[PDB]
Design a protein around this ligand. Structure first.
Ligand SMILES: CC(/C=C/C=C(C)/C=C/C=C(C)/C=C/[C@H](CCC(C)(C)O)C(C)(C)O)=C\C=C\C=C(C)\C=C\C=C(C)\C=C\C=C(C)\C=C\[C@H](CCC(C)(C)O)C(C)(C)O
Ligand SMILES: CC(/C=C/C=C(C)/C=C/C=C(C)/C=C/[C@H](CCC(C)(C)O)C(C)(C)O)=C\C=C\C=C(C)\C=C\C=C(C)\C=C\C=C(C)\C=C\[C@H](CCC(C)(C)O)C(C)(C)O
Ligand SMILES: *C/C=C(C)/C=C/C=C(C)/C=C/C1=C(C)CCCC1(C)C
Ligand SMILES: *C/C=C(C)/C=C/C=C(C)/C=C/C1=C(C)CCCC1(C)C
Ligand SMILES: *C/C=C(C)/C=C/C=C(C)/C=C/C1=C(C)CCCC1(C)C
Ligand SMILES: [Br-]
Ligand SMILES: [Br-]
Ligand SMILES: [Br-]
Ligand SMILES: [Br-]
Ligand SMILES: [Br-]
Ligand SMILES: [Br-]
Lengths: 259, 259, 261
């Protein structure tokens, strides 16, 4: 089987791939330090709950990229019969191996970082427990079935079937984000910053299943190095600037979020 | 090294095993649709919290059966010396490999579904946080040790030690169902419906450890084909028919569970 | 998958040190559960009982953890990266010599489950709000998970220590809540004396873990697998079993102080 050090060497040796992971390790790390410094003045527990939940997003992110760049959460899988990338090979150093580079480390950690994005947003919008629970549970289900899709190599049909279940879970999250929380925000007095984050979230999040479908996991029209940067670019907005904006607001409106 | 492709095909060529899986994938999916249209009328956040966790049971189920049917969450493990299934073979294709067919995928997802059934029941009985936390934590411990039980291939005795630990956690759950929530349901005003679901749950759940003990995992007096159906049958009652009854009540008494 | 669970199971056995460090705690943990259940029988206030159940779950996670290690289910033989002081080591498993080191990752995996429980009890005992409980618990979990990643990384020596550093960062957050935040909250909750004792006990023992990790095979390798295992089992006996014994001992004589809601 392929070795962890080999995937690690495969990431290096490939500038596109290496830069998409190592840059976000630095960016997530700097984001954490920046965010902690920005909220060192909060005093209200609810505002502080929102801040910590937000800060956890890049915390999980930095561990995710370290797991990917270290080769710990990457594997070489062979696609099933009729998969647009079946018969492909990867080549580690001087050897060649059948399969595609499957970076499942992303799908796995999303199940931990996205619930946190949703938690901060829901709270910021004055959501009640029932909606938080719904958004979060289905969001986690979306991430897990997506991971399952990437890890399934027995059938091409199964892969897209998992993908469909994940899409169904995704619409549930979309519904509360666009319909439910958009209304709550007004009642909480945060409609302004929410609108911004909601639009940002929805637009960025929609990009993930597109990239998945266009990359080696899907119809393989994009290389692993390209698909990886697309995700990394999405992360920079959906996580880092998204967190900067929320915490920039939060620190200037601690009283309104206090309740 | 057995490939996922082989286990998938192995599920075929064996109508008994295959049917028990694909049939529940459809019953789960259908159940979800029904439940969504049944709870369309609810407007009480507490009533909707109960319905969402109830709906999450079949949602986790479709995913579990898909993982199993696809071969993702199935493995062939050689049982330890002295084990009644030790020395068996499976033969995936034209070749024959030592071991048994372990469907650990079921034990894994229970740690996600069972907690949802319990959340529903606990909320119905007007349980307090302490009793909810107790049932859910010990319930998860029950599932995970069962999974550990099934994956232990080093010692026959260790497998059974796991089994015991799992049974001990099980009694904790049974004790809050039969004794604790039974009393709480009175103050809530749902002793009626609770008594029904409560009696249903306990009897069905009580059957899982028995199937495990009889199947290839335990004494091996039952073929994987029958053992699989036993669980499938049990799920249909412990999950789908159970969810329907709870949701049916809920939709007719939203004012009762409200608050 | 050359190294089978069986070989690992038998490697533990036939190695008195290692075996004893695992089996002794399967017994100590089990006896602890019984003792704690027995001790808490007379509790009635739901909040007091939350603290008790949270505390009791600690030895529950522990008995399962040790079973996973002794059974060989959560142990693996891994080859250390170039530069690691243990690179080029052999374990001699079964009737063959195997490259690598015996990595007991099962300990790290379960800490993510038991430590959050130690923290819930303490936090509750200190009369903590939800924000601090949530912060303490998520960073505690992050600490455990990144510690597990550190021991599971075999590609690069620098990556291993980088995971370790991230994990340490998570650790200071837990240490700051315990030493700064809850220390003050306990004064308001009327549990100052007992929290401070348990605060110190917890802080002192928890510092032992990253030290053992650094000194043992996963780290600079001055401690062979058998001795790093016993060090952790020794730490667990104090940080889990006796820590819980002392907390439950106080709780059962002061149910009213923590009664609240
Ligand atoms: C890896 C790395 C840096 C890691 C840094 C970490 C983990 C620091 C986390 C700090 C936190 C969570 C502080 C809590 C405050 C709230 C404190 C409390 C409520 C507990 O009193 C607040 C207002 C949110 O800043 C760099 C490269
Ligand atoms: C493997 C093994 C032993 C396993 C033992 C188990 C699983 C026992 C769990 C008991 C519990 C949780 C008791 C709950 C009470 C509270 C009850 C409640 C709030 C639910 O009414 C209380 C006062 C805390 O003892 C031994 C060897
Ligand atoms: C920090 C990471 C973020 C915000 C990730 C978001 C990911 C998604 C919205 C992923 C969605 C997917 C589907 C809807 C279909 C199946 C595949 C996925 C997992 C890529
Ligand atoms: C939808 C699934 C349900 C309701 C599953 C319930 C499962 C159990 C009550 C399993 C219990 C087990 C034991 C108590 C001992 C060891 C083996 C198990 C995992 C079958
Ligand atoms: C029952 C187990 C307990 C109380 C375990 C405590 C473990 C720690 C405080 C571990 C900390 C670590 C770091 C700060 C750095 C990396 C390695 C670890 C996981 C040993
Ligand atoms: Br606070
Ligand atoms: Br992430
Ligand atoms: Br609602
Ligand atoms: Br399930
Ligand atoms: Br209680
Ligand atoms: Br543990």
């Amino acid at each position: 089987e392929v070795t962890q050090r080999e995937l690690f060497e495969f990431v290096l040796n490939d500038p596109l791939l290496a830069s998409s992971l190592y840059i976000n390790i630095a960016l997530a790390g700097l984001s954490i330090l920046l965010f902690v410094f920005m909220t060192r003045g909060l005093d209200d527990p609810r505002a502080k709950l929102i801040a910590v939940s937000t800060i956890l997003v890049p915390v999980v992110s930095i561990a995710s990229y370290t797991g990917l760049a270290s080769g710990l959460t990457i594997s070489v899988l062979e696609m099933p019969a009729g998969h647009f990338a079946e018969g492909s090979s990867v080549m580690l150093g001087g050897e060649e191996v059948d399969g595609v580079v499957t970076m499942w480390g992303r799908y796995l950690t999303w199940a931990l970082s996205t619930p946190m994005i949703l938690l901060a947003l829901g709270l910021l919008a004055g959501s009640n427990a029932t909606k938080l629970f719904t958004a979060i549970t289905f969001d986690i289900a979306m991430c897990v079935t997506g991971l399952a899709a990437a890890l399934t190599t027995s059938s091409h049909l199964m892969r897209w079937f998992w993908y469909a279940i994940s899409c169904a879970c995704f619409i549930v999250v979309l519904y509360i984000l666009l319909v439910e929380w958009a209304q709550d925000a007004k009642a909480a007095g945060t409609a302004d910053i929410f609108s911004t984050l909601k639009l940002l979230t929805v637009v960025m999040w929609l990009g993930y299943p597109i990239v998945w479908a266009l990359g080696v996991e899907g119809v393989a029209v994009l290389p692993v190095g390209y698909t990886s940067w697309a995700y990394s670019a999405l992360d920079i907005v959906a996580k880092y600037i998204f967190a900067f904006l929320l915490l920039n607001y939060l620190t200037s409106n601690e009283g309104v979020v206090s309740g």
